[PDB]
Design a binder for this molecule. Structure first.
Ligand SMILES: NC(=O)c1ccc[n+]([C@@H]2O[C@H](COP(=O)([O-])OP(=O)(O)OC[C@H]3O[C@@H](n4cnc5c(N)ncnc54)[C@H](O)[C@@H]3O)[C@@H](O)[C@H]2O)c1
Ligand SMILES: NC(=O)c1ccc[n+]([C@@H]2O[C@H](COP(=O)([O-])OP(=O)(O)OC[C@H]3O[C@@H](n4cnc5c(N)ncnc54)[C@H](O)[C@@H]3O)[C@@H](O)[C@H]2O)c1
Ligand SMILES: NC(=O)c1ccc[n+]([C@@H]2O[C@H](COP(=O)([O-])OP(=O)(O)OC[C@H]3O[C@@H](n4cnc5c(N)ncnc54)[C@H](O)[C@@H]3O)[C@@H](O)[C@H]2O)c1
Ligand SMILES: NC(=O)c1ccc[n+]([C@@H]2O[C@H](COP(=O)([O-])OP(=O)(O)OC[C@H]3O[C@@H](n4cnc5c(N)ncnc54)[C@H](O)[C@@H]3O)[C@@H](O)[C@H]2O)c1
Ligand code: NA
Ligand code: NA
Lengths: 392, 392, 392, 392
C-alpha cells in the first residue's frame, strides 16, 4: 500500500518509515503493531504489511533518510544498524512542499521553511498543488495521514466550515482567514477519494464540511489526535475509580519534552489545541468534572523522550481522600510510529469493506475520537475488535 | 441482613462496621460502595443497606467499639464524630472465641490471644463450637465473611482436601495437621446453609471438598483475596500493554505497611500466601511471564497506610524499551471496608436468585478469583454487571 | 517575647501561634524548631521560648482562634485537642486592619477584606496607623515578621527605593504608585527600632532605602522568603552533582497546592515573585544555568498540602545522561510555623548582641537570602552555627 | 600511572578503562571526575591523567576489550565510536587468574570461571602467585584497586584477623577457612608497598591485621564500598532533616538491577555485605535509628541500570508526619568508573606526600568509610578539600 504523510520529515513519520522497512526486511519484530494482534489475523488479506511513502513538508531536507538521521542523531531511538539498512530505501523518499497556512506562531520554532502560500498562491491554486502532489502518487491502495505539527484553534466560522458548499465557497472566495493547512490536505485527500486520518489535534477533517464530503465521496476517515502515552494511561486508569464507586476530586498531568513537537507546543496558541483535547476526557468517562490541569512544557534535554507526571487525588469510603502517582518515561515516536502503520491498514481495510464517513470504531487510537463518546480504553478496544469482526 | 465476620476485631472488619452504621444513620456518603452504582439499582430489593454484625476473634477485647477505637487511635482514618456516633451500636457487638489452627508463626505478632484449640478441643468439638456461635446468630439473610489475618500455605493433602467425604474423615479422625482455621469456618458456614466469602488469601472454601459441599447444600460462595489497591491497578493497567501489542519484560511491586496485617505478613510462612496470589496474575492477562517480583515489607510508621511502588519495563516498536512508574498511597481499610458490604449484599442477592457453588462472576472483588481465568478489571466489571442483569 | 505578624490570620501565622502555646503548655514536642537544636543551647538566655502575639490583617475575623479554626477545619494539620487547649489564649489575639497597597490581583481570592487605603488615607496617614498599632504593642523584646500573601514585583523606582531620604520623599509626596504594603510595614517596624524578617518573597526591607534605615537605627533584619519544602531539597540536593563533577542539564519543579496561598499565587502577577525567587538558585550553587522550569498551579483538593514533583536530568562520565526524580508531600504550614518562631528568637538574640543591618547569617531560613551568595543548605547551616557561636 | 584492578573484566573496571583512554585521546570530556574539579587544580603534578592497566580475574576472556564489549553490547552505556577508538589499547590489557576464595555462593552466577585455589595451591602459594602478577606489573606510580564482585561476611576470627603476625600465621598454617580472596589481594598490594583501595564492601584491608601492615610499610589505603548512587543521595539528603530538627521515623530503600553485580548480590550470603553497609549510615548522621529497610533485588531487563526507590517518612512541627519520595535512574558503571580514576589519583598523591595508613579523608568516595564517623556528603567533601589543601 501507499501512505502519503503530511509532515513527512517529522520524527513520528520518519520512524514509521524506518520501522516499516526494517520489519519488511525482517530485521525487526512486529511489537507495538495493533494490526498484528491475533484477533486481527486476516487483515493482511486487505492491508498486507507492505508500504511505499510520500508526503508534504515545509522544512527543507534532501530526502526522508536525512530527515530520519537528524532525529536519530539526537534521540538514538533505534539501532545504527537499522538506519544503515533502511538508508537507500529512505533516500528515495522525497517530500513535496506543502502549506503552513494559519499553523500558529509555533511554526517559527522549525527553523528553515518554505511553503506554497509563500509562493503567493491563492487557496484554489494551493489546493491544486496539494492534489496534484497526492494524485500523482496515489493509487487504489493509498491513504493520507496527517502527522504534522499541531496547529492552534482555527478562526471560527459557521459559513465556511459548516457545509461542503460553504467550505468550497471559501476556496472559491480565497478567504484564507478561515482555512488552516490541515483542512486543505484533508479536503484534498477526500476530493481524490483517499482515506484520511489525523494523528494531530488540528481540526483536519473534523469539521462538518469535510465529514459531509467524506460521506458523499464514500470515503472512510479517522481521528483525532494519537493517544500514545499519558492519555492512554489516563483512559485505561480512570475507569477503575468509577468501577469502584470513588470520586476523583483532582487530576494533574504535567508533560515535559523537547525536540520539534515540544518546541512548537511551546507556543501559547499551538499549546491550546493539545491541552483542551486532554482536559474534557475525564468527564466522558466519569460523568463529572474533577479539578483537572494538563500542561506541556518545553524541556530540551529530553528531546523526544516525553516524560509525564500525573497525580490523582480521590475520595473513597466515608469520603476519605487518598493518592496515586505515576510517571511515564517513553520516547513519543516509538509509541506513535506503529500506530500510523495500524491506522493506515485499518483504513485500507475499511475502504475495501465499503465503509464511509467517520470510522468511529477506530476511537482506540485517538485522544479526541470523532463521532463517539467512548473514551475508556477497554471499551474502545472491544469496539475495535467487534468492528473488525463484523467486516472481516 | 446479618454478617458474621471472621476476624471481627480487625481494621477492615471494624471499619466496615463503623461505615455501615454511619451510612445507616445518614452521616456519611455511599462512596466506595460498588453495590450502590446505578447499574445495580434494584439490589436493595434483595439486599437492602441494613446490617447487624457478629463474628469470631482470637484477640481479647470487650467489644467491637473498643476494637474500632484501637485502630482509629493509630490511623484516624475516619472522623472522631463518626466514632462517637457509632459507639453505642458497636459496643453491643461482641465477638466469639475462634480458632487459630495452623495460622502461621505470624499469629505471634497479634499479642494477647485465646483460641478454641488452646482449650484442648478436638476438631469435631471445635467445629461444633464454631457452628453453635454462628447458628445462634444466623438467620435467612446471613452471610459469613472471612477477614482474618492471612494464613500460610496449608499442609498438602489429596485425601483430606480432595472430597467432602475425605474432608469429613479429617474431622472424624481429628487430623489437625491438615486443617486450617479458615477451612473450619468455611466448612461451618456452608454446613449451616449460609453464603461465604473469603476476603483473605488463606485457602478458606477454595478446596474441592468445600466447593463440593457448597454445591450439595445449594449455597453460593466467593473468593479469594480482596483486590483493593496495588493489584487493582495492576489488573486495570496491565491490559493496556497487551491492547497495544507491547511486551512487559519486567514488573516490580513493593509494598510497605504496618499495623497487624503488616506485622503478621512480616513472617516468612504467612507472607508466602500473599506473594504467590500476586505473581501469577500478569500471565492470566498477557499470556506470558514478565520477570515479576512482589514484596511486602513491614514499616510501622505507616500503620494501615499501605503504600506501594511499582515499576513496569516494557518493549514497544522495534523493541525499544521504555518505563512506567507508579505509587499508591491509600489506607487499606478504606479501600477494603465497603467491599465487604458489597460482597455480602451480592451474596444475599445470589442466594435469593437460587445461585449455588462458586459465584465466579464476583471475580471483580478478588485477587485470586475462584473458578475463573478473567483477571482484567475491565472484563471483570462487565462480567459482574451482566451477571446481575441476568438475575435481577 | 512579643511577635507582631503581618498576615496574622494566615495558616502559617496561626499555626506558629497554636504551636507556641501548645509547647508552652507542654502538650507538644519541640520538633521542627531549629533554635532548639543542641548547638543553640544557651539561646533561651536571650530569647526564651515564651511568646505573645499581635499583627496586621485585611481579612475579617473576630480573633486568631476563629482564624486558626478556619484553616484547621480544612487541613486538620494538628489534633482537635490542641485547638481546644489553645483556644482561650488565641481568642485574645485580635489583628489590626493593615494595608493591601499594590498587593496584586491575587488579593481578590481572599474574599471579604478591609484595608487602610480603602478608608482613603494618604501614605503618611497609613504609615501613622501602622506604627501606632505596633508601638502600642511593642516592647524591648518585640520583633515584626511578615507572613502575608505574596505580592507581585513592585513598580520600579531608583528615586523612591534607592535611599531612605528618597523613600521618605515618597511618603511625603503620597506617591502610592511606588509603595507596596510590605515596604510600609517594614518601614514602620524599623522606624520603631524593632527587628524585622520577611517570610514572603515580596520586597519588604530588601530595598536599599530600608537596608539603610535598619543600619542607621542599628536594627537587625532578615529575609527573604521562607525556604521550607521543595527549595530546601533543592539547595540540599543540588551541591551533590557539583561535588561529583556532574553537569545538571535540566531541572523541573512543579508545585500544586490550594488554600489561600495557592489561590493568591494562582494570579499571574503574584506568581511572578515566587517563580523568579526559585529559578536563579541553581546558578548560585553550580555556577552555570541548567534549563530550569519552576511552576505553581492551584489544586484545591490539596489545600495546604503543597505537593511538588521535580525531575533532575544530568550528565556524568563520558557525558552519559541519567535521571533523578523526587516528590514532596507535606503540609506547608507545618514546615513553616516553627521557623517563624526560630527566626524571631534568632532576631531577638541578634538584637541583644548588638547586631544591625541584614543578618546575612540567617540565610539558612530563606529562599532569597539578602546580602549573601551562600545558597547551599549545608554551607548555610554551618554559617548559622558559627554566626551564633561567635556571639553567644 | 599504573592501576592494577581486581575484577579487571567487570563493568566498572572496563568502563574506567574505556573512559581513561577516551579522555586521554581527547574524544570525551572530563565530567564525573572529582579529581578534575578546580579545588584539586595542581593534582596533575603528582597524579597526571595518564593510565596503564592490569588486574586479576576469574572469568575467562581473551582481553579487556572483549570484556568491555560484552558489557557494552548489553548496556550501550557509551557510544560505539568510543569502543572502536579504544579497542586496540584495550586488547593489550590481559588479566591474570586470581582467587575466588570464600567469595560466596553468588560467584556461581558468573558462569565460566577458573581460579588459583582450583589449581590446588596453598594459601602461601596463592599469595606468591598474586604478588608475582602485581610486582611484575607494578612501578613506583602503581596503585591496586578492588572492583571485584561483593563477597559475603567472612568467617569470624580474632586470632587470624586481629594482627599482622596473626594474619601471617594464617598463611603459614594454610587456614583457608579464615581467608577471603579480597584479604589476599590487599595483603599482596601492601606487602609490595603499593597503595590500595577497596571499591566493594568485602573486608579487603579493613581488618586490623592489614591496617597494621599498611602503617608498618608506610602505605596509604582507602575504603570501603563506592558510594555512587542511592547512598550518595542518602548521605546528601539525610542531614537536611537534622538541620531542621525533624525526626526521620522510617526510611525505605529498594534497589533493582541486573547484570553480574545484580546476579551475584542475588545470593543471600553475598547480599548481606551490601545491606549492612547501607543500614547503619542514618544513625551516623542523625544519632538515632529510624526504621530503615534496604533491599537489593535482581531484575534482569535493567542490566547495569540500577534503579532505586526510597521513601522517607518524618515527623516535623507538633509531630505531624509528612512524606518524601525519590527515584534514581542511572547506570552504575557511569557513576562508578571515574571514581576509580579519582581514587587512584588521590592514592598516588597521598603516597607522594608521605601519607600512610587509612586515608580517612577519602571517606567522600565510600559507603563504609574506614577510620571515620563522617558520613554526611557535605562534611566529607569539605574534609577532602581541606585534606588536599594541607598537602598540596
Ligand atoms: N506520541 C507522539 O509522538 C504524539 C502523540 C499525539 C500526537 N502527536 C502529534 O504528531 C505530530 C508530529 O509529531 P512529531 O513528534 O513527529 O513532531 P515533529 O515536529 O518532529 O514532526 C512534524 C513535521 O511536520 C512538519 N510540519 C509542520 N507543519 C506542517 C504543515 N502545515 N505542512 C507540512 N508539514 C508540516 C514539520 O516540519 C515536521 O517535520 C505533532 O502534531 C504531534 O503533536 C504526536
Ligand atoms: N486492603 C486490605 O485491608 C486488604 C486487601 C486484601 C486482603 N486483606 C486481608 O484482610 C485481612 C484483614 O486485614 P486487616 O488489615 O483488617 O488485618 P487485621 O490484622 O487488623 O485484622 C485481622 C483480625 O483477625 C484476627 N484473626 C487472625 N486470625 C484469626 C483466626 N484464625 N480466627 C479469628 N480471628 C483471627 C486478628 O486478631 C485481627 O483482629 C488480612 O488477611 C488481609 O491480608 C486486606
Ligand atoms: N511553607 C510555606 O507555608 C511558605 C513557604 C515560603 C513562603 N511562604 C509565604 O508565607 C505567606 C503566608 O503563607 P500562608 O500559606 O499562611 O498563606 P495565607 O494566605 O493563609 O496567609 C496570609 C495571610 O495574610 C493576609 N494578607 C494578605 N495580604 C496582606 C496585607 N498586605 N496586609 C496584611 N495581611 C495580608 C491574608 O488575608 C492571610 O490571612 C505567603 O506569602 C507564602 O507565600 C509560605
Ligand atoms: N555503582 C556501582 O557499579 C557500584 C557501587 C558500589 C560498589 N560496587 C561494587 O563494585 C564491584 C564491581 O561492580 P560491577 O558492577 O562492575 O560488577 P561486575 O560483576 O561486572 O564486575 C566484577 C568482576 O570481578 C570478577 N570477580 C569476582 N570475584 C573475583 C575475585 N574474587 N577475584 C578476581 N575477580 C573477581 C567478576 O568476574 C567480574 O568480571 C561489585 O562488588 C560492586 O558491588 C559497584
Ligand atoms: Na526513567
Ligand atoms: Na503521599
Amino acid at each position: 500500500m501507499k501512505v502519503w504523510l503530511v509532515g513527512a520529515y517529522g520524527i513520528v513519520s520518519t520512524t514509521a518509515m524506518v520501522g516499516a522497512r526494517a520489519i519488511e526486511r525482517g530485521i525487526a519484530p512486529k511489537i507495538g503493531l495493533v494490526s498484528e494482534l491475533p484477533h486481527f489475523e486476516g487483515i493482511e488479506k486487505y492491508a498486507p504489511f507492505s508500504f511505499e511513502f510520500g508526503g508534504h513538508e515545509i522544512r527543507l531536507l534532501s530526502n526522508a533518510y536525512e530527515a530520519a538521521k537528524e532525529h536519530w542523531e539526537l534521540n538514538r531511538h533505534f539501532d545504527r544498524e537499522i538506519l544503515e539498512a533502511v538508508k537507500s530505501d529512505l533516500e528515495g523518499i522525497v517530500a513535496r512542499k506543502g502549506t503552513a497556512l494559519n499553523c500558529g506562531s509555533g511554526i517559527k520554532e522549525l527553523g528553515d521553511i518554505k511553503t506554497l502560500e509563500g509562493e503567493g498562491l491563492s487557496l484554489a491554486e494551493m489546493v491544486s498543488r496539494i492534489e496534484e502532489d497526492i494524485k500523482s502518487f496515489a493509487d487504489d491502495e493509498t491513504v493520507v495521514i496527517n502527522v504534522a505539527s499541531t496547529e492552534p484553534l482555527p478562526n471560527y466560522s459557521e459559513e465556511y466550515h459548516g457545509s461542503l458548499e460553504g467550505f468550497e465557497r471559501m476556496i472559491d472566495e480565497d478567504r484564507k482567514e478561515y482555512a488552516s493547512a490541515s483542512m486543505l490536505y484533508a479536503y484534498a485527500a477526500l476530493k481524490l477519494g483517499l482515506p484520511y486520518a489525523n494523528f494531530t489535534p488540528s481540526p483536519g477533517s473534523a469539521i462538518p464540511a469535510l465529514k459531509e464530503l467524506a460521506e458523499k465521496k464514500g470515503v472512510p476517515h479517522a481521528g483525532n489526535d494519537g493517544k500514545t502515552g499519558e492519555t492512554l494511561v489516563k483512559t485505561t486508569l480512570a475507569p477503575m475509580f468509577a468501577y469502584r464507586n470513588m470520586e476523583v476530586v483532582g487530576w494533574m498531568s504535567y508533560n515535559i519534552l523537547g525536540d520539534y513537537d515540544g518546541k512548537v507546543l511551546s507556543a501559547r496558541d499551538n499549546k491550546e489545541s493539545k491541552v483542551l483535547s486532554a482536559d474534557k476526557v475525564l468527564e466522558k468517562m466519569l460523568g463529572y468534572s474533577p479539578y483537572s490541569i494538563t500542561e506541556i512544557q518545553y524541556f530540551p534535554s529530553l528531546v523526544d523522550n516525553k516524560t509525564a507526571f500525573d497525580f490523582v487525588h480521590f475520595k473513597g469510603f466515608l469520603g476519605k481522600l487518598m493518592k496515586f502517582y505515576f510517571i511515564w518515561d517513553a520516547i513519543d515516536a516509538i509509541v506513535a510510529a506503529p500506530l500510523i502503520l495500524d491506522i493506515a491498514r485499518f483504513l485500507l481495510f475499511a475502504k475495501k469493506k465499503g465503509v464511509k464517513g467517520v470510522v468511529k470504531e477506530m476511537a482506540f487510537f485517538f485522544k479526541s475520537p470523532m463521532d463517539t463518546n467512548v473514551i475508556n480504553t477497554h471499551e474502545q478496544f472491544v469496539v475495535l475488535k467487534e468492528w473488525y469482526s463484523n467486516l472481516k
